[PDB]
């Protein structure tokens, strides 16, 4: 019943890792390797469940992260034939809660994922063949269901034995209404040891006062709903409800609305483990001070020899408010298809029960071109889908529609350690999936950038690179200069979209890549959506002009080329560049080309000056940086290092149908050398491409950080570049190594920025790795 297991990530249920990757700095996040596929739409709030069956990831509070199991949130199975057996389908709690429950033995089945579908196939315990397919309706080109806070658990049971079986399927859940909010919002900003600003998150975990549960029973569906008394109007962050439903007509329904998840769970288990029933309870008493509450239902059915039954179970959660900074209130996009009152969980669940099979068909339909591609390896089909997981679990925001944002505004975090949105340098590579599958969301993000470019915040704030532990004497720079390009679209502790350039490790008002990134993204988004959206192009054009003028001020000598200087001033933000760099110089030339193309289409007056700049700048870049084998890092440092991502501009120019920014023979020779050195002489091509090595495969400096890291998303960009330049075998080999490192070593559903050669990672749950879609785009004909 797992469809195309070979294009799915699989692991035996509850099989762990001998030696997973671990975080390279102790102050940074490492929950360990037990992430499974997240459930829930983008910006819906999401929950994750591990390959052991534990619901351990709670992202119901928009942009916030909690990792921890609530053992009572779980499916349990009872079967009786020859023998009687009953198991909760998670791991045994370590702290002794639910001591009466028995837990499914590890290694007795397969967990499989191709996002947004996953499967538990249970085998070798029960006599029935039992599969649970878990999915949310994540649909490309669909700006409705993709936002929904629903998970479908589609169970298939079949009896392969000579004897009739009695089965019962239970879902219990703890009422967490009111838990998912910050009691310390707009808190003091601390500088962490890696230089990043951090805030304090103090959720109301375990605060259940007023929480109650009721059974739901109609002609069509039955289950439970988890609420809180009172429910204010309007709701505040944390206010809402859960529901879970099955259709009627499928067997005998046992409901128990109120049981104690902190106790031994015997009230439930003494019935369930014996005959698959529960004691009848419909008790909406609000929970007392100090008291936790949970609900459960079980469905009991018989399965005759050779019979197959399916049971759809749907969970829905209606938490409509995302509050960011204190008093900064947005509604979630799904509210446009119900309302903003936070009283809709049953109606959402009901819609799911009605539509789940349609949604399942639609998922098979959009994935079918990928799975049937004749020139894509199995691992790639798998990773292409699986890397979409971050669009759900990356602190994703998707707001309610407005006139100027007709499908809502959208944002994914750079990551959990680096808690701000849609970092521009990062999305250069990381935004290829969003462009291809949700181009209206892609456009809203770029429109948010466009609007922010002219704004300013003169307020002086600490720059982390320079911080020496005293706030008052610390070097500070203006939050944002008018017409500078912001690094990001703000943070979940402030105001996403509207308050930009939140990052403070460097002063991004000085960065030399961001302006080019902005232009290249605008043009790419216009071109790859048919070259017809003149509204998008006209809206972004003033910002294109402002961006390029901003970056042109950093051309000190007037040769046409902006020069790096000072603190690290581009995406490799622990790596100092001096003078014209290959990286930023390249992006600049590709940007100018892009602005010339778009500006000509739009008939704009700036086109003449961009052609003059490019006529000076383009020959000059080769003239300055060619060393005979590759492009020099920069003009000022005298470094002999090979930067793997030196010709990012040439990748982009060609991707965009624009003229080569360098001689294609030089491009090809540079790229061959990057591959032969940065990949093949970095521990023999075991990890992928290091960002910078000497021509002999040694580090320039054995202690440097960025040069000696493999950036997953940079590697995917490089693969795409290789493929576009005709080095096909090379692209597939490099991309394979990176996928294997992630999906074999405990990084699945938390893909990081960086791996080292020493079993360590940096910045789990990272935006860049969606760059695997750039390879799909260049190789995908069709
Ligand atoms: Ca919040």
UniProtKB/TrEMBL annotation:
<dbReference type="Pfam" id="PF04685">
    <property type="entry name" value="DUF608"/>
</dbReference>
<feature type="domain" description="Glycosyl-hydrolase family 116 N-terminal">
    <location>
        <begin position="36"/>
        <end position="359"/>
    </location>
</feature>
<dbReference type="InterPro" id="IPR052566">
    <property type="entry name" value="Non-lysos_glucosylceramidase"/>
</dbReference>
<dbReference type="GO" id="GO:0004348">
    <property type="term" value="F:glucosylceramidase activity"/>
</dbReference>
<dbReference type="GO" id="GO:0005975">
    <property type="term" value="P:carbohydrate metabolic process"/>
</dbReference>
<dbReference type="InterPro" id="IPR008928">
    <property type="entry name" value="6-hairpin_glycosidase_sf"/>
</dbReference>
<feature type="domain" description="Glycosyl-hydrolase family 116 catalytic region">
    <location>
        <begin position="408"/>
        <end position="775"/>
    </location>
</feature>
<dbReference type="InterPro" id="IPR012341">
    <property type="entry name" value="6hp_glycosidase-like_sf"/>
</dbReference>
<dbReference type="InterPro" id="IPR014551">
    <property type="entry name" value="B_Glucosidase_GBA2-typ"/>
</dbReference>
<dbReference type="GO" id="GO:0006680">
    <property type="term" value="P:glucosylceramide catabolic process"/>
</dbReference>
<dbReference type="Pfam" id="PF12215">
    <property type="entry name" value="Glyco_hydr_116N"/>
</dbReference>
<dbReference type="GO" id="GO:0016020">
    <property type="term" value="C:membrane"/>
</dbReference>
<dbReference type="InterPro" id="IPR024462">
    <property type="entry name" value="GH116_N"/>
</dbReference>
<dbReference type="GO" id="GO:0008422">
    <property type="term" value="F:beta-glucosidase activity"/>
</dbReference>
<dbReference type="InterPro" id="IPR006775">
    <property type="entry name" value="GH116_catalytic"/>
</dbReference>
<protein>
    <submittedName>
        <fullName>Tlr0193 protein</fullName>
    </submittedName>
</protein>
């Amino acid at each position: 019943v797992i469809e195309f297991a070979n294009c799915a990530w699989t692991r035996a249920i509850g099989q762990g890792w001998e030696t997973p990757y671990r975080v390279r700095y102790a102050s940074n996040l490492d929950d360990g390797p037990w992430y499974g596929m997240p459930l829930g739409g983008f910006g819906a709030g999401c929950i994750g469940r591990s390959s052991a069956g534990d619901f351990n990831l709670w992202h119901v509070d928009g942009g916030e992260h909690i990792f921890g199991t609530l053992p009572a949130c779980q499916f349990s199975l009872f079967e009786q034939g020859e023998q009687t057996q009953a198991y909760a389908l998670g791991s045994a709690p370590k702290d002794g809660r639910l001591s009466s429950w028995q837990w499914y033995p590890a290694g007795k089945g397969t967990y499989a994922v191709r996002y947004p579908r996953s499967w538990f196939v249970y085998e070798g315990v029960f006599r029935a063949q039992i599969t649970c397919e878990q999915f949310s309706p994540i649909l490309p080109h669909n700006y409705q269901e993709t936002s929904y806070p629903v998970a479908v658990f589609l169970w298939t049971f079949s009896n392969p034995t000579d004897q009739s079986l009695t089965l019962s399927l239970m879902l219990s859940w703890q009422n967490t209404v009111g838990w998912f909010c910050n009691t310390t919002p707009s808190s003091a900003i601390a500088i962490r040891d890696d230089g990043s600003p951090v805030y304090t998150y103090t959720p109301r975990w375990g605060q259940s006062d007023g929480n109650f549960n009721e059974l739901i029973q109609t002609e069509s569906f039955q289950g439970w709903r988890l609420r809180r008394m009172p429910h204010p109007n309007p709701p505040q962050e944390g206010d809402g409800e859960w529901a879970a439903l099955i259709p009627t007509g499928l067997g005998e329904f046992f409901g128990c609305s109120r049981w104690q998840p902190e106790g031994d769970g015997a009230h439930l288990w003494q019935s369930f483990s014996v005959d698959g029933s529960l004691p009848f309870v419909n008790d909406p008493t609000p929970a007392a001070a100090g008291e936790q509450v949970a609900a459960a239902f079980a469905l009991r059915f018989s399965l005759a020899p050779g019979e197959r039954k399916q049971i759809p179970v749907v969970l829905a959660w209606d938490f409509p408010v995302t509050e960011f900074g204190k008093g900064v209130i947005y509604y979630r996009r799904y509210t446009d298809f119900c309302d903003r009152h936070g009283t809709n969980a049953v109606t959402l669940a009901a819609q799911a029960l009605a539509a789940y099979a349609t949604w399942q068909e639609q998922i098979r339909t959009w994935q079918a071109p990928i799975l049937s591609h004749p020139d894509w390896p199995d691992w790639f089909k798998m990773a292409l889908c699986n890397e979409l997981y971050v669009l759900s679990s990356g602190g994703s925001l998707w707001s309610a529609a407005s006139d100027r944002d007709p499908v809502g505004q959208f944002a994914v975090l750079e990551c959990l350690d680096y808690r701000w949105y849609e970092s521009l340098d990062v999305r250069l590579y990381g935004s290829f999936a969003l462009l291809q599958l949700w181009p209206e969301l892609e456009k809203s993000v770029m429109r948010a950038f466009a609007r922010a470019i002219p704004t300013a915040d003169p307020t002086l704030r600490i720059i982390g690179y320079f911080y020496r532990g005293d706030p008052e004497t610390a070097y500070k720079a203006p939050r944002k200069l008018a017409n500078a390009v912001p690094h990001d679209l703000g943070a979940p502790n402030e105001h996403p979209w509207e308050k930009t350039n939140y990052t403070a490790y460097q002063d991004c008002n000085l960065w030399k890549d961001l302006a080019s990134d902005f232009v290249l993204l605008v043009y790419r988004d216009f071109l790859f959506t048919g070259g017809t959206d003149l509204n998008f192009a006209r809206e972004c054009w003033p910002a294109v002009v402002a961006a390029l003028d901003h970056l042109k001020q950093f051309d000190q000598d007037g040769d046409g080329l902006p020069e790096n200087g000072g603190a690290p001033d581009q995406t490799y933000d622990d790596w100092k560049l001096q003078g014209v760099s290959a990286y930023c110089g390249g992006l600049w030339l590709a940007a100018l080309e892009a602005a010339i193309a778009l500006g000509t289409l739009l008939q704009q007056p700036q086109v003449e000056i961009y052609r003059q700049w490019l006529s000076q700048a383009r020959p000059r870049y080769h003239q300055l940086l060619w060393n005979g084998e590759y492009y020099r890092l920069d003009t000022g440092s005298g470094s002999d290092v090979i930067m793997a991502d030196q010709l990012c501009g040439q990748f982009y120019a060609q991707l965009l149908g624009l003229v080569d920014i360098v001689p294609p023979d030089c491009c090809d020779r540079a790229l061959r050398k990057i591959y032969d050195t940065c990949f093949l002489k970095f521990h023999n091509g075991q990890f992928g491409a290091a960002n910078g090595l000497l021509p002999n495969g040694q580090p320039e400096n054995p202690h440097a950080t960025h040069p000696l890291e493999v950036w997953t998303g940079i590697n995917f960009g490089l693969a795409a570049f290789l493929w576009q330049r005709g080095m096909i075998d090379e692209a597939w080999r490099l991309a394979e190594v990176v996928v294997r490192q992630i999906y074999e070593n405990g990084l699945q559903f938390r893909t990081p920025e960086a791996i080292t050669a020493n079993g360590t990672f940096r910045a789990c749950m990272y935006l860049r790795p969606m760059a695997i879609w750039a390879l799909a785009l260049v190789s995908g004909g069709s």
